Design a protein around this ligand. Sequence first.
Ligand SMILES: CC1=C(c2ccccc2)C(=O)N(C(C)(C)c2cc(Cl)cc(Cl)c2)CO1
Ligand SMILES: CC1=C(c2ccccc2)C(=O)N(C(C)(C)c2cc(Cl)cc(Cl)c2)CO1
Lengths: 258, 257
Amino acid sequence: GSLTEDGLSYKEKFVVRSYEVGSNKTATVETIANLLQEVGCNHAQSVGFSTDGFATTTTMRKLHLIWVTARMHIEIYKYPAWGDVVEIETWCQSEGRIGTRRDWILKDSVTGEVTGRATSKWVMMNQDTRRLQKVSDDVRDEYLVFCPQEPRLAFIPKLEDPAQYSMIGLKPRRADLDMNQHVNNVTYIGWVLESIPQEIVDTHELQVITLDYRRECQQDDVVDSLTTTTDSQFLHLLRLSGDGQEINRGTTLWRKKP
Amino acid sequence: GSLTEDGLSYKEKFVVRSYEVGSNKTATVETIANLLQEVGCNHAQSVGFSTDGFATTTTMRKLHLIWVTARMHIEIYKYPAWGDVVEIETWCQSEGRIGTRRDWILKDSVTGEVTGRATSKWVMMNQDTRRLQKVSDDVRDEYLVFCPQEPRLAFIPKLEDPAQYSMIGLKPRRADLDMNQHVNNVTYIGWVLESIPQEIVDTHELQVITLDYRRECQQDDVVDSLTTTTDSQFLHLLRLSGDGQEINRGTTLWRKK
Ligand SMILES: CC1=C(c2ccccc2)C(=O)N(C(C)(C)c2cc(Cl)cc(Cl)c2)CO1
Ligand SMILES: CC1=C(c2ccccc2)C(=O)N(C(C)(C)c2cc(Cl)cc(Cl)c2)CO1
């Protein structure tokens, strides 16, 4: 991949792999989320951020601050097949003192058609206290020149008991942990979807997913995935085993297979 | 990637991805096993096999047979870092009537130094009955021309109760199922390693894994991973939760970091 002409966005091509696809021989939404993160990480490395975190700025490192996902919104018009080339363009925008927003456009590299779009909201957290805080001038100074400064946009209630559907006792595997031994953001997507009935997954494609991130799942945590029906639309809640804390809430929109 | 000069092997380069690495910022053994499968799948497609199975020949389709892994043996000398370029060469050889053998060599793309090797034995079976079939002349005729004909080589007891270590209630998620709707062969590797104590994983690197595949885990099955100590060496057993039907047995060899 590489920075675009103006150095304010980053493009990368990916060949969809045999193990990245599900029943339809098309990329899973988990694969798409992984590719989105990869092109985001590669953008960060191309403008000189260190590999030790997600675009931790010098001052963020001294103050023990990290970027964490508040929200992820993905819309897929067409999932690319095994062996297809997808091109993903990504950029990051400052959102004043609240945090940063990373956006993505997915294209079929052969046709140039837009096959999907994504947007994510990231906030700053003290890595030690897990408390959120406003982006200071000092931190913004260290990344604003890498961001388009005119707007460039690619583009949830709490599930009530009883849930219509559930998948309980979901556990992180060592493969779900990133370099920092934190649960990968993409695992949460997989967990949300686990409580959708197989009959829906077998006959529908996921068109839209919106996830709110409340709290991390640790390596030794156990998670329950809860789903209620609200094209089919669902409301989602991930919470810790034992009526523990909410970790995620979300919605999905599914379209009938063709 | 592409077929090599003589058309009897396939090479592909991979740039190791951010999410493919663990603690040391080097590729997981699960990532390496996935890349091995991918370069194997891409070889199959380059010599004309369709995506509907793992290199199902015309006659295998008529007889309702598929290739399944009987045994996987991987040795890693050096796990490549995030952003490193690894080159994998792969080829397939007939094993008389027993089945096929796919081998892999992993190299540092820049130095040509061999960083790993793998070999796998694959057998023909009806997925539903699990009944094994010796490779007939008619099936061999449909793939032998894509294989080197002279040998080219890249290069287990049942755990007794009680196991020293265990991880119980392991269940496949939707991402663990392949395009043909069965549990990915790499999931079994992850499950085996789940019962290795954290203290070993934190201080050691996996140098060797040998897995014997006894029968498939279905989408709704629940698995127990059992490990006993035998450089540290372990014996491994994956069995169905409840009835204790054997799914896999294996051994691992770990070196200090
Ligand atoms: C400085 C910065 C950038 C950033 C901004 C402009 C250019 C490159 C990175 C950035 O993308 N950040 C976030 C947190 C959005 C990010 C997202 C992703 Cl999926 C990967 C990385 Cl590794 C990081 C925040 O901090
Ligand atoms: C015909 C064939 C080939 C084969 C033989 C020569 C050239 C290409 C494929 C082959 O590789 N087979 C196995 C089953 C070993 C294989 C392994 C892998 Cl990791 C992927 C595929 Cl998709 C299949 C079996 O049958």
